[PDB]
Amino acid sequence: SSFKAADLQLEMTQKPHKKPGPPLVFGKTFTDHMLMVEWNDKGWGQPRIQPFQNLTLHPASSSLHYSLQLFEGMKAFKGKDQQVRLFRPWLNMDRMLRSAMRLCLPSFDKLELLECIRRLIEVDKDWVPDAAGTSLYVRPVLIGNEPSLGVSQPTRALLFVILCPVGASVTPVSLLADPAFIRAWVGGVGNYKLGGNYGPTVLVQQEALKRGCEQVLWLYGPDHQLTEVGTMNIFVYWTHEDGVLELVTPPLNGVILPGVVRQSLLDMAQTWGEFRVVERTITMKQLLRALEEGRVREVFGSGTACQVCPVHRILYKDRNLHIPTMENGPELILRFQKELKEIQYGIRAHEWMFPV
Amino acid sequence: SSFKAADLQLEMTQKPHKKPGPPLVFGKTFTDHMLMVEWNDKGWGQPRIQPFQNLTLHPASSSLHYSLQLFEGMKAFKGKDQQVRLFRPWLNMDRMLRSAMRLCLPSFDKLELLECIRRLIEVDKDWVPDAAGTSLYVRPVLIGNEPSLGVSQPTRALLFVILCPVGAYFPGGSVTPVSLLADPAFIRAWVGGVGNYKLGGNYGPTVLVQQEALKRGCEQVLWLYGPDHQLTEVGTMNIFVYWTHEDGVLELVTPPLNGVILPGVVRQSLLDMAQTWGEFRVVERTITMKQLLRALEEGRVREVFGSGTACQVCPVHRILYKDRNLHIPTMENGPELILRFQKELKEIQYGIRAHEWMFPV
Numbered sequence: 001s002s003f004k005a006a007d008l009q010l011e012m013t014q015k016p017h018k019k020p021g022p023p024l025v026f027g028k029t030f031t032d033h034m035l036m037v038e039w040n041d042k043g044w045g046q047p048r049i050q051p052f053q054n055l056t057l058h059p060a061s062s063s064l065h066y067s068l069q070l071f072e073g074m075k076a077f078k079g080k081d082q083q084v085r086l087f088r089p090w091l092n093m094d095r096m097l098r099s100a101m102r103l104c105l106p107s108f109d110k111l112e113l114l115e116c117i118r119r120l121i122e123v124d125k126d127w128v129p130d131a132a133g134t135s136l137y138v139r140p141v142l143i144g145n146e147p148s149l150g151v152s153q154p155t156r157a158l159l160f161v162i163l164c165p166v167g168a169s170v171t172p173v174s175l176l177a178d179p180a181f182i183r184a185w186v187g188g189v190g191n192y193k194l195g196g197n198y199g200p201t202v203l204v205q206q207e208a209l210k211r212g213c214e215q216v217l218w219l220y221g222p223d224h225q226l227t228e229v230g231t232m233n234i235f236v237y238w239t240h241e242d243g244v245l246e247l248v249t250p251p252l253n254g255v256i257l258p259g260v261v262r263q264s265l266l267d268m269a270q271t272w273g274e275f276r277v278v279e280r281t282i283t284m285k286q287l288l289r290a291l292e293e294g295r296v297r298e299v300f301g302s303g304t305a306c307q308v309c310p311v312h313r314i315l316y317k318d319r320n321l322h323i324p325t326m327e328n329g330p331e332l333i334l335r336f337q338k339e340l341k342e343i344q345y346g347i348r349a350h351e352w353m354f355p356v
Numbered sequence: 357s358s359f360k361a362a363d364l365q366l367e368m369t370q371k372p373h374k375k376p377g378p379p380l381v382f383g384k385t386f387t388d389h390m391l392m393v394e395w396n397d398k399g400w401g402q403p404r405i406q407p408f409q410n411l412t413l414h415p416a417s418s419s420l421h422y423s424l425q426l427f428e429g430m431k432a433f434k435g436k437d438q439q440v441r442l443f444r445p446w447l448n449m450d451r452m453l454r455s456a457m458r459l460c461l462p463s464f465d466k467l468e469l470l471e472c473i474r475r476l477i478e479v480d481k482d483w484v485p486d487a488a489g490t491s492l493y494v495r496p497v498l499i500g501n502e503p504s505l506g507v508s509q510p511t512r513a514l515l516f517v518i519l520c521p522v523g524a525y526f527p528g529g530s531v532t533p534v535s536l537l538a539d540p541a542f543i544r545a546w547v548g549g550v551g552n553y554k555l556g557g558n559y560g561p562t563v564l565v566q567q568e569a570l571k572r573g574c575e576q577v578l579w580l581y582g583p584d585h586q587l588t589e590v591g592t593m594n595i596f597v598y599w600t601h602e603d604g605v606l607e608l609v610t611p612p613l614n615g616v617i618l619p620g621v622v623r624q625s626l627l628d629m630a631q632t633w634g635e636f637r638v639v640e641r642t643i644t645m646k647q648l649l650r651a652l653e654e655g656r657v658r659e660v661f662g663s664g665t666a667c668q669v670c671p672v673h674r675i676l677y678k679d680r681n682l683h684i685p686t687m688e689n690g691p692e693l694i695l696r697f698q699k700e701l702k703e704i705q706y707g708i709r710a711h712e713w714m715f716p717v
């Protein structure tokens with residue numbers, strides 16, 4: 001029953017907002033327009049681009065009671081030629097549909113939404129900044145909207161998309177590694193980008209700050225597996241226990257969100273063929289031995305907001321572990337950053353980019 | 357640092373809803389008014405009772421993106437004397453504040469919100485039905501309302517309360533027993549998670565699982581946890597087993613509050629009543645499928661049942677454990693204990709017997 005971009009409805013604002021002045025804080029500033037699509041028992045309605053406006057919801061909306069909500073996060077970059085491109089948007093649409101199905105929310109056509117998103121970004125092109133290291137953040141959302149307190153498959157839903165000009169990497173982060181905090185469980189929904197996975201992390205992150213750390217290192221299992229850092233996937237660049245240099249990141253076994261940047265770093269590294277690229281469980285036990293034996297070169301997080309984020313300290317069992325990421329260049333990090341920048345800003349042509 | 361009931365602003369409705377005629381569907385019908393209190397950097401605003409209306413929310417509202425939401429559920433009952441009473445509402449206030457603290461949502465004064473809820477139900481008192489087994493379901497909600505995509509402690513929040521006249525939760529509710537799907541592949545909660553808080557995030561993921569129970573011929577989900585398949589909860593209810601234990605003692609057992617169990621008000625009440633009676637052992641202990649399978653084949657199980665505000669005591673007659681279809685003899689055993697719990701709750705709830713558990717409206 002998918003909505004169609006052909007049926008799009010445009011309604012331009014009466015009074016555009018004054019763009020930012022070359023200090024942009026992430027996700028606070030929004031653009032003039034937004035996409036909105038309604039679903040009900042008659043199926044999907046016509047998508048519309050409309051001025052950025054509030055949502056009107058029935059107070060029993062299942063979005064607000066039973067967390068029938070999921071989101072996405074992706075970026076559009078403006079090249080020198082003032083051309084704007086989305087990075088691997090198809091993977092975000094893929095992941096959004098899976099999230100949708102997990103919450104019994106309505107199915108939709110991935111290319112239709114991608115086209116609607118394209119048009120929306122097209123309409124707000126001038127918001128997309130071109131300054132170094134800047135981008136447009138795109139936040140699609142699908143929430144349920146059943147006006148009743150039954151916990152059930154909804155018969156109403158809203159799909160909408162907002163846009164944020166953003167700025168920001170160079171500086172590393174410190175992590176709190178405390179196993180009392182568990183982000184996701186095998187058989188759970190940690191591998192889907194559902195709102196309910198995030199709310200509970202707010203307190204945990206406050207604890208990390210009180211303990212002088214900047215982010216949370218999410219550990220899993222009795223053997224303390226490194227799963228993710230904050231809202232980022234985790235990569236370790238080391239010489240492994242079998243003497244072979246490798247880039248490792250935990251495998252998609254259910255507690256890991258399959259990042260787009262994660263997959264892209266795996267793709268890039270493999271393409272180079274210069275070292276082993278593997279998806280494997282990483283335990284604190286292995287990390288310690290590797291640190292004491294000097295085999296660790298870099299540790300970083302990956303995610304759309306902070307594409308490659310160096311890690312230099314992990315506070316584990318009340319004692320600080322130094323991570324020599326910044327001493328080792330960080331060569332791999334900077335190399336990852338350089339190529340992604342070349343691709344994203346259109347210096348190198350690449351099928352990963354989708355032009356707006 | 358809290359709204360005050362003394363500052364309540366009343367805005368009566370100018371378009372009153374037609375009240376239900378002579379068949380209530382749970383959670384679909386709403387009363388004329390609602391409670392509403394906003395929070396921001398200046399603190400709690402003034403509370404208001406206003407006509408039932410839509411919420412206006414910024415599109416980046418942290419309630420919709422990062423699930424900064426929690427809710428409660430409790431009942432008001434009208435006795436034959438027309439006096440309306442709330443069942444142990446203080447426990448709901450206690451639990452709501454714990455949820456709020458877990459999601460870094462703003463604190464409030466439990467006794468002030470309770471008074472505000474009293475004032476709200478008082479306005480809509482004629483919505484409270486009085487037919488047998490009817491009540492008014494009270495749904496408070498607290499949500500974050502930050503118009504920012506950062507995952508962080510909100511600087512804006514929204515506390516509201518809506519009301520539903522209700523009958524039974526499902527047709528033949530609390531009378532006709534239910535069947536459960538017990539598959540270990542499904543996880544509701546985990547130690548170190550937030551399953552022991554009444555947060556919206558715990559419920560959305562269960563919809564698909566409930567569909568799968570229907571698909572396999574069952575009505576509710578028996579949530580198992582751990583290697584040894586512990587019976588945690590049934591649907592949105594706590595689970596109780598009344599049996600003769602392996603040590604030959606007749607006991608009422610329910611899983612303990614170790615992190616994967618939502619501390620139900622009805623649960624606590626059933627434990628309180630049973631322990632007070634002093635007629636049989638009453639324990640909080642984990643319960644495994646192996647213990648249940650073994651207790652069944654030795655004919656030691658009397659009654660298995662769920663508890664929760666919407667279906668206070670819900671009998672269970674069947675459990676599908678993987679491919680093994682298990683018959684639970686709850687109904688052939690009276691269900692003597694279920695009936696006694698129901699009878700005593702009713703007398704307390706509809707004002708037959710004055711009791712410290714009832715808060716008058």
Ligand SMILES: *Cc1c(COP(=O)(O)O)cnc(C)c1O
Pocket residue numbers: 073193228230231232233257258259260261262302303304305
């Ligand atoms: C969004 C997200 C990521 C990374 O996703 P990208 O698709 O690379 O932006 C990693 N972990 C978690 C928990 C996330 O929510």
Ligand SMILES: *Cc1c(COP(=O)(O)O)cnc(C)c1O
Pocket residue numbers: 429554589591592593594618619620621622623663664665666
């Ligand atoms: C609300 C709830 C219960 C029971 O709570 P009561 O306070 O007894 O209504 C049990 N389990 C879950 C998962 C719940 O959400």
Ligand SMILES: C[C@H]1CNc2c(cccc2S(N)(=O)=O)C1
Pocket residue numbers: 149150151383429525592593620663664665666667
């Ligand atoms: C649709 C309602 C039905 N009832 C409950 C809900 C949520 C949490 C607990 C319950 S309970 N404990 O009242 O069964 C949603």
Ligand SMILES: C[C@H]1CNc2c(cccc2S(N)(=O)=O)C1
Pocket residue numbers: 026027073231232302303304305306505506507
């Ligand atoms: C404000 C944003 C910051 N970044 C992310 C958020 C949520 C989910 C994933 C991310 S990520 N993976 O892009 O860092 C919140």
Ligand SMILES: [Cl-]
Pocket residue numbers: 088089090091351352
């Ligand atoms: Cl791609």
Ligand SMILES: [Cl-]
Pocket residue numbers: 191252253254258
């Ligand atoms: Cl996956």
Ligand SMILES: [Cl-]
Pocket residue numbers: 444446447712713
């Ligand atoms: Cl009490």
Ligand SMILES: [Cl-]
Pocket residue numbers: 552613614615617619
């Ligand atoms: Cl608890």
